[PDB]
Point group: C3
Chain length 411, copies 3
């Protein structure tokens, strides 16, 4: 039989998922998703006793529902079946947003989404080069999380720049049950913004007033290995070392406010790219207590051996996918990332078996390969070496090694 | 390329979601949903200390899958990603049902669905005029909840009336682990049943035998502000006052049975509509205990400034959507609702800090505006004023104010 | 309007769900699901006091997403909304897998799937003849569960046989946080493998090293009645007897290893089929403790009164659906299953109120009828009679009776 429509002409597409769209741009629907299956093995600092643990789990398992109605109104609902983002009271959302669009070039986004701070975070988790995002997000995780609901405005400006800003109602309350309000700004100058020709300078700022609020400020980096503690399958369990670098449990009235500044750069030329982000955080303490300070950076270099550039999008100021040219071979990509963090918490005044008085430091070397078999499937492996200072596992190790592999299917 | 089918002719449709159906009425599939993002601020009675709290949350985030097979067999599975209906044992279902239509005009529905009691409850939550349903459902929660599994028969009768009835296995057990069985009946005479031309008179009854059964009978109305306590994001937390009007926790053998009678009326002429429901509840006590009695009503006036009538459907005896006439400006609707409830629990014999001996009373005034931007998008604001008698917050407040806004997207 | 595509020609299908596929076999998407609504009533051994309990619940409520990309890469994501498989840490997955078929006839499967042990488990839960799978799986539930992540290879061999093997990272850890590794093998010789013409002989083996691991080894068969303890609705709650036949809670260091051997057969002559499985399990104990041993079998006879054979698939070595010949009548099927299990746990050295020293035994007789209304809808009733030895409920009953009905809708 035939397949017709009552309304405007429709075009349908499938690469394993589904797209249906009217040709007049008025209405559309997209059903997609991503599955990331990880297996990692790790030892030393990463585990409590320093022996090898493992983790087999889905890093992400999203079902993704998006569409357009009446040209200017869009929605996106991405739900994480692996339970690695969200919780069972707010919901396991990667995203639940509505966007208008009508004030083009200015876009207005409402709902649950990650606030815009950082190039690596802006980049789709399908296409982040490394298997895990950088260490600096571990020391300031509120700046670009989606743990709340808000409103964002964004615009490409003068065809060479991108600006975003939001107010976000966090799921942290003050003593009156009034939510902590988070403010974000991000501005990117990107005078070259094509795949294989990117020059990117970004500045970003986040602020929240913490007065009379109960907020968890414990900084507990996994140090580049997800499997020390993760949902989606299994992890190192009771032998996983997720060490406390500094900060406190959610006790009301410990802090005044929390501020983060970030500077970022990226340069892409053909198959080569370099990117780096630096951030500085200060949590101002209340009455007699000491401030919590944290800073860090990462630098990443990447090279597609098969020649294809990483996609770049000025709208969002973010990298994206690699589309393989050779349909049999696929695309092959090598990368290296260096990460370095420092946490200052002078509230820590006595030594322990795992924490020495002074600044906790962490650094990682990540070396990896991505095989893009095609636009649906990506197979990856990362070697990670961690080194810490003034923090260790219970065994006294200040270094650890890990190897993680991932099978990714997107539709 | 071409798009064809190997069965009967298919028609496809998208307005943000997806519909695929054979033109012989034999098979169909519909994927849709609804996202309701709320932000509320509220004080006085609504909070424990009387100060202003807020709540940013999804009221609902449904993914909706429905279809038809072999003409006469329908299914509908609606899942709440916002976690506001259901739980993590029974499932977060808005609906999971199978309908057989072969005995048309009689329909048979099986599974998890809300039992049919009340016009406002029968009305789709997409199209309920106010941001929250009326206070009388707070005093008789069980009469129209979906907290169980059952069988329902319903029919339009003589083109002028609607009847439904169900037996429902509640998720409440007696001492033998046998489920409380819930019985529902509803009958509506609607001699006029078209948009802008409605005369609706309804009677409804609900009964359950509670002998040796553990059932939560606590009546804890939110008093017209969802944000005092809700899933889907954040709420007033430890400062949210959800006051106990009466009733008891789930203990086996406190009660003999539970009966509810309801009367309802609705009238529409063009863009104006009025609707009202009254209910009376008695829970018969065992032993030397006193009965639990509750009664209440609401009345709602609504008017579409732009002239469009509310849709009305005789099948279900329910109001429905407003379709905007003007594609540029959309439709604008004003409404007022008055709610009034009374709870009599003579088991309460001593005063407490928030509850006086005697009948607890609550009334609200709700004033609101809906902008239907188009058939996908509705933006709303409600102002709510509450007044209680013999119940207060910890601050001794018996009045509260709230302002709540919603962005809704349906597909 | 028209419906077109910009890639290869597409065929779309709906029977309540959706399929979309390119005619060159390169890309496809399939959205489907299954809803199984059960109502059971049961007494005697099945309940703690021997009185009648009930259970109204969804046995399964899967949404099913599957597809193909670039010909050789397949995914399948099945999520259980009824909460009866998986958990809220690993996810409620029936399946989350990627299959590479490039090495055809050898298929490679990655992710979360049931390990391949047993004909009745290989059979889709849509088409399992009885409402609940056999008792032998209750005594060795790890051999074919999906509580972990792994890799499986499988192949039809020489047009007359099927072989599968896997390694599976279990969600059980040793003291180092290294997962218990499960190994499976299954081989089936099926020289006749067509509907109504089946001769099936299979051998299967499962092994896991449990050294220094914490694993729940409690054997707690429901004895043929799901309703004693289930998610998806309601169950017998505090009056549900799920008796402990033997084994221990997850204490690290109790066991050395766990081995299961299985033998199976199936025979089909037109509308008649017979199938049986036998298994034996030994959990070797550490240090001064006694081994846990379990063994059992089931035998099932099935006959389609209306004449249609059960489908059989050599790829997977499994039975499948019945496709009704009479559009009006549908298909009618009768079956009888006998199940018999024995659990030997010599660590039990003193009598209790519910358990006598010696081998715990259980046997069931299941008699049932299936009405396949059409290919989407199946209505079922099973009568179950249980008999136990050396184990009872608190009332002292060693026999129980149950009647369960199901409405199933598949799309
Ligand atoms: C101190 C300011 C805090 C404000 C935080 C608000 C976060 C709540 O976001 C929920 C979104 O719902 C808002 C509803 O308004 C929709 C308006 O849409 C109009 C589009 O043209
Ligand atoms: C000796 C009489 C025992 C029977 C007492 C039960 C009377 C009440 O019956 C209510 C049955 O509830 C039906 C619930 O079924 C819901 C599941 O729907 C799926 C149908 O297979
Ligand atoms: C192709 C990328 C790998 C990621 C796929 C996710 C599946 C994770 O499963 C973990 C595999 O565990 C197997 C480890 O077992 C160790 C012994 O292996 C012996 C195999 O004969
Ligand atoms: C034609 C197909 C070949 C079938 C061979 C399969 C044989 C394995 O079946 C497993 C069932 O074993 C049951 C053994 O239990 C013994 C029954 O004792 C009853 C004595 O009266
Ligand atoms: Ca029950
Ligand atoms: Ca709040
Ligand atoms: Ca592990
Ligand atoms: Cl879910």
């Amino acid at each position: 039989g035939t397949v017709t429509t009552d309304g405007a002409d429709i075009v349908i597409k499938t690469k394993g998922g589904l797209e249906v769209a009217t040709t007049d741009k008025e209405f559309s629907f997209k059903l997609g998703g991503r599955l990331q299956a990880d297996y990692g093995r790790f030892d030393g600092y990463y585990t409590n006793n320093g022996n090898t643990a493992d983790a087999a789990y889905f890093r992400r398992a999203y079902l993704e529902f998006g569409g357009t109605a009446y040209r200017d109104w869009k929605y996106q609902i991405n739900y994480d079946l692996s339970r690695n983002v969200g919780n069972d009271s707010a919901g396991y959302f990667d995203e639940a947003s509505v966007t208008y669009t009508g004030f083009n070039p200015v876009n207005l986004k409402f709902g649950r989404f990650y606030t815009d701070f950082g190039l690596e975070k802006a980049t789709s988790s399908k296409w982040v080069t490394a298997l895990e995002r950088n260490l600096t997000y571990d020391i300031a995780d509120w700046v670009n999380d989606n743990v709340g609901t808000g409103i964002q405005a964004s615009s490409v400006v003068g065809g060479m720049a991108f600006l975003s800003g939001s107010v976000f109602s966090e799921n942290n309350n003050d003593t009156d049950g009034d939510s902590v309000k988070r403010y974000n700004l991000r501005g990117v100058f990107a005078p070259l913004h094509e795949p294989g020709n990117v020059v990117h300078l970004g500045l970003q700022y986040a602020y929240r007033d913490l007065e009379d609020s109960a907020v968890d400020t414990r900084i507990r980096p996994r140090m580049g290995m997800r499997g020390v503690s993760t949902n989606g399958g299994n992890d190192a369990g009771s032998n996983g070392n997720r060490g406390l670098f500094g900060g406190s449990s959610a006790v009301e009235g410990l802090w005044k406010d929390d501020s983060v500044w970030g500077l970022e750069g990226a340069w892409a030329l053909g198959a080569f790219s370099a990117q780096a982000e630096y951030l500085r955080r200060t949590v101002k303490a209340e009455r007699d207590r000491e401030d919590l300070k944290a800073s860090g950076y990462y630098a990443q270099l990447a090279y597609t051996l098969t020649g294809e550039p990483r996609l770049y999008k000025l709208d969002g100021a973010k990298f994206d996918t690699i589309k393989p040219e050779n349909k049999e071979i696929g695309a092959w990509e090598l990368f290296y990332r260096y990460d370095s963090i420092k946490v200052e918490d002078d509230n820590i005044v006595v030594d322990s078996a795992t924490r020495e008085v002074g600044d906790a430091k962490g650094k990682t070397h990540t070396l990896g390969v991505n095989w893009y078999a095609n636009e649906a499937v990506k197979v990856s492996a990362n070697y990670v070496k961690a080194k810490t200072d003034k923090i260790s596992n219970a065994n006294g190790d200040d270094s650890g090694d890990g190897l993680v592999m991932r099978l990714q299917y997107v539709f």
